């Protein structure tokens with residue numbers, strides 16, 4: 001027999017993602033690089049592995065949409081809500097949605113896609129918002145050139161462990 | 167940091183359920199008796215008690231739906247997904263939905279509702295799928311043709327590890 005896990009987390013370490021569509025704001029290449037680096041933020045401190053799929057059903061389906069886009073969390077046009085992601089689970093679980101009424105960038109203008117994605121993928125892996133003001137999972141956007149804060153390290157390792165520690 | 171905490175088990179032994187609507191396939195009486203019997207499977211070997219409500223909010227809301235039916239876990243017409251249930255918790259937690267594109271029966275002409283409900287209520291109470299091929303919680307429907315149902319030992323040990331013996 002099997003009881004349900006104590007916390008919402010993936011039960012396998014090999015996860016797949018798919019970029020379903022792209023923002024007008026950045027090249028395909030810029031978006032792919034941003035997401036790849038965002039996943040590496042988390043794989044670097046756990047045993048998780050992320051492989052990209054070009055079609056079909058992935059564990060983490062990533063898309064850009066506006067207003068109503070197929071869930072209970074409609075976006076709201078420019079400004080306000082920027083993105084959201086669903087906790088590990090069946091079907092839409094793990095999926096990450098970005099509001100394409102925002103301006104997404106590879107730089108410090110608008111919202112840096114890498115940084116917001118890194119935050120959203122935290123949710124896709126089972127992290128909620130943190131009260132640690134320095135945490136990646138703190139619910140307020142900040143821009144910098146990346147090292148993952150310790151609060152997020154402790155959080156993600158509480159779920160999946162550290163993977164290779166060196 | 168914060169993770170998404172799972173309610174492993176119900177915090178209370180006395181649970182309510184409500185049959186929100188009914189399948190065309192069976193009489194109201196047949197449906198009510200199947201669900202009552204499905205709960206009895208679990209209450210017979212634990213301290214859990216189940217009482218039916220006819221109106222308002224209940225711990226376990228039971229309904230029949232087709233395709234997209236309000237939770238963004240859509241059913242798929244005849245065959246495939248038969249039903250799903252949410253693990254213990256608030257909101258949708260505990261709720262059980264049956265695909266009304268399936269044929270439901272009190273016998274063997276279709277899917278026996280009692281059996282599928284007994285399995286689905288296992289999920290409502292915090293059981294995941296078993297790997298024991300003889301378990302009720304094994305994810306493959308089977309019908310024995312016997313007038314009496316005996317809860318397999320795997321499921322008994324499973325549910326009692328959560329709630330203890332009656």
Ligand SMILES: CCOC(=O)c1cc2cc(-c3cncn3C)ccc2[nH]1
Pocket residue numbers: 082083115116117119120134135136137138139140141142143144145149
């Ligand atoms: C909806 C708002 O949530 C976010 O998207 C979000 C992005 C983000 C980035 C940083 C950060 C920047 N440089 C270093 N860190 C740790 C810190 C918190 C953050 N939150």
Ligand SMILES: CCOC(=O)c1cc2cc(-c3cncn3C)ccc2[nH]1
Pocket residue numbers: 248281282285286300301302303304305306307308309310315318
């Ligand atoms: C696809 C979802 O899984 C189910 O709906 C399901 C129903 C079911 C019934 C029995 C059974 C019948 N007679 C005695 N047992 C133990 C065993 C396993 C089962 N799984």
Ligand SMILES: [Ca+2]
Pocket residue numbers: 075076077078079080081082099101102
């Ligand atoms: Ca917005």
Ligand SMILES: [Ca+2]
Pocket residue numbers: 058059060061090091092093094095
């Ligand atoms: Ca998904």
Ligand SMILES: [Ca+2]
Pocket residue numbers: 023024025099100101102103104
């Ligand atoms: Ca845009």
Ligand SMILES: [Ca+2]
Pocket residue numbers: 241242243244245246247248265267268
């Ligand atoms: Ca179906």
Ligand SMILES: [Ca+2]
Pocket residue numbers: 224225226227255256257258259260261
């Ligand atoms: Ca409920």
Ligand SMILES: [Ca+2]
Pocket residue numbers: 189190191265266267268269270
């Ligand atoms: Ca039907």
Ligand SMILES: [Zn+2]
Pocket residue numbers: 069071073074084097
């Ligand atoms: Zn969304």
Ligand SMILES: [Zn+2]
Pocket residue numbers: 119120123129139
């Ligand atoms: Zn967030």
Ligand SMILES: [Zn+2]
Pocket residue numbers: 235237239250263
């Ligand atoms: Zn449903």
Ligand SMILES: [Zn+2]
Pocket residue numbers: 285286289295303305
């Ligand atoms: Zn099941």
